[PDB]
Design a protein around this ligand. Structure first.
Ligand SMILES: [Mg+2]
Ligand SMILES: [Mg+2]
Ligand SMILES: [Mg+2]
Ligand SMILES: [Mg+2]
Length: 52
RNA sequence: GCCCUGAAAAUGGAUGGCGCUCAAGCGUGUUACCUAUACUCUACCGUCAGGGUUGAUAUGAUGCCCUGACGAGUAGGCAGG
């Protein structure tokens, strides 16, 4: 009642809870998604070999 | 050309000094040698630029790592402590 829900309006006049600018807080799962993984090129060595 | 005369100032006095006369002087030529915080190569610190790396089961993706270049400073500005 005090702060409101998705089906109940908040008792505060004209107030709604703030929105999210990102859907989830774990970007690891977003990267590990099939669509992202199927569009990227293979990665490197993570520690480049010294050539000269 | 060199040297000499012309050429007199006040504390004692300065090719920097000693001293030097086929010079250790003057003109000219040939080599060797000495040494700057400059140049060349290397290491280390920092700054700037271009890049690599999220895949869990280990901690900083403002992380870790690869590559190149650069570094004087009053008044003054900005940044990290
Ligand atoms: Mg001579
Ligand atoms: Mg030097
Ligand atoms: Mg310099
Ligand atoms: Mg400086």
């Amino acid at each position: 009642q005090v702060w409101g829900s998705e089906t109940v309006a908040s008792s505060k006049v004209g107030y709604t809870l703030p929105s999210h600018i990102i859907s989830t807080s774990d970007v690891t799962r977003i990267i590990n998604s099939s669509e992202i993984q199927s569009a990227i090129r293979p990665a490197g060595q993570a520690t480049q070999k010294r050539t000269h």
